[PDB]
Homo-oligomer: A and B are copies of this chain.
Amino acid sequence: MKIICNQKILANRIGIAQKAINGKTTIELLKGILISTEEGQLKLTGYDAEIGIETYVQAEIIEKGDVVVDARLFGDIIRKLPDSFVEIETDSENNIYINCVNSRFKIKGYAAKEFPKLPLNEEDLYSIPQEILKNMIKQTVFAISQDQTKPVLMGELLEIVDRNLNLVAIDGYRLAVKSCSVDSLTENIKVIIPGKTLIDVNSLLSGEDNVKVGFNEKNAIFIINDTKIITRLLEGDFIDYKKLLPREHNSRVKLNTKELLNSIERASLLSQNNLIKLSIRDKVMAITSNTEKGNVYEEVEIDLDGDYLDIAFNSRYFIEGLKNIDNEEIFIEFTTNVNPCIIKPTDDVNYIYLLLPVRI
């Protein structure tokens, strides 16, 4: 193998392939990135049982071939080289020579022979705006279970129903749902993707252009410019989340998102399970906590329709919600002090954050 590429591009694409490398893998080779020549183009593959990534690096191909390199060492070298041309060559022992301005490295390489093939379509690929998918993941993924006895709830439900795309995260205490109507999504689909993997996907989305998405029985595939991400789907049944959305509310407040966040943050300084209390009255909502460490009384201006209410919540769950809402104002809907609240941005019909109270 013998190729020449730009340093900045190679470093950038190594970072992308690295996302699929599992440092705790049991298969030695899978700590490596597969480099392989194609046509005016190098391909980099990172592979794990849960996630495969292929990415392209424009290159002059002097001599075709492939080799596997330790993904961490490869990245550490390329990252420190100056912004110039990088020459990469292999010998018949699979040594890798990397040359760039006044640097010459020779490191160990490994035969490509046993490197997994990546599982597909392009006709069965659908176009979604990056910004949308980005925001969908961002506004939900923090809400997945961390309970490893519930692997399914460590996934998010991605569902297309009648040209609506929905991404759903639930953990037994809160539920986050973000929707968009996308026209290209003419087929109904329901799958569960590990949230960990959706975080990786989100990191590769820029916010311009589209990501092309496809699904089979075993995998979801995301195409972002020249990058292909393949994510193993979770098998099983998702919680029937639609049944948890209240049909009615007895109270509805409107308030400034950041104002509430700041107040909960302050109130939570004392309660650090993390309890805070909301006292909904006309014109003001009080946020309080009382520990033996002290008490906090915070006030936030509200507009109220409906009943006065006192209700307790986990501050972390509340904070994690409000942190991820850039909207200036939110509505929050309530019924009784044992039922969830529902947060809805005033200027976004497409997002729900539902949260169970603490019965105390």
B293, A103: Cβ atoms under 8 Å?
no
Which residues of A from 148 to 168 have beta carbons under 8 Å from B? none
Tell me which residues from 103 to 119 in chain A have a Cβ below 8 Å from any Cβ of chain B.
Answer: 103-108
0/1 per residue, A235-277, Cβ < 8 Å to B? 0000000000000000000000000001101100110000000
Whether A293 contacts B73 in the complex (CB less than 8 A), given A80-B262, A266-B80, comes out as: yes
CB contacts (< 8 Å) of A73 on chain B: these are 269, 293
Q: Is A297 an interface residue (CB 8 A)?
A: yes
Total identical chains: 2
A300, closest chain B residue (CB) = B102
Q: Is the CB of B294 within 8 A of A102?
A: no
Instruction: Give A71-101 as 1s and 0s: 1 = Cβ < 8 Å from B's Cβ atoms.
Output: 0010011001110000000000000000000
B residues near A297, Cβ cutoff 8 Å: 103-105
CB distance from A265 to the nearest CB of B (A): 6
Cβ of B103 and Cβ of A266 under 8 Å apart?
yes
A80: B residues at CB distance < 8 A = 262, 265-266, 269
Q: Which of A265, A266, A294 counts the most B-chain CB atoms under 10 A from its CB?
A: A294
- Nearest residue in B to A289 (C-beta to C-beta)? B105
Task: Answer yes or no: A295 CB below 8 A from chain B CBs.
Answer: yes
Residues of B within 8 A of A81 (CB): 266
Q: Does A57 contact B (CB under 8 A)?
A: no
* CB under 8 Å from chain B, chain A span 273-328: 293-300
For A299, the chain B residues whose CB sits under 8 A away are: 102
A103-B269 Cα distance, complex, nearest whole Å = 12
User: In chain A between 94 and 147, which residues have their CB closer than 8 angstroms to a CB of chain B?
Assistant: 102-108
Smallest CB separation, A6 vs chain B (Å): 18
Distance in angstroms between the alpha carbons of A339 and B108 in the assembled complex: 34
Chain B contacts for A107, CB-based, 8 A:
270, 293-294
Residue of B nearest to A81 (CB): B266
> Chain B contacts of A300 at CB under 8 A?
102
Docked pose: A80 CA to B266 CA in angstroms: 7
A window 163-218: CB within 8 A of B: none
A77 is contacted by which of B76, B82, B104, B269 (Cβ under 8 Å)?
B269
- Per-residue contact bits, chain A 44-81, to B (CB 8 Å; 1 contact, 0 not): 00000000000000000000000000000100110011
In the bound complex, how far is the Cα of B73 from the Cα of A297, in angstroms? 16
Q: Find chain B residues with CB under 8 A from A102 CB.
A: 263, 298-300
A166→B352 CA distance, assembly (Å):
63
Are B108 and A294 interface neighbours, CB within 8 A? yes
Q: How far is the CA of A308 from the CA of B123 in the complex (A)?
A: 66
Q: What residues on B are CB-neighbors of A82 within 8 Å? A: 262
Q: A73-B269, A76-B269, A269-B80 are in contact. Are A295 and B262 (CB under 8 A)?
A: no
Report yes or no: B106 in contact with A295, Cβ–Cβ below 8 A: yes
- Could you give 10 example pairs across A and B, Cβ below 8 Å? A73-B269, A80-B269, A103-B296, A103-B297, A103-B298, A104-B296, A106-B295, A107-B270, A107-B293, A107-B294
A interface with B by C-beta (< 8 Å): 73, 76-77, 80-82, 102-108, 262-263, 265-266, 269-270, 293-300
Closest 6 CB pairs of A and B: A107-B294, A104-B297, A102-B299, A105-B296, A106-B294, A80-B266
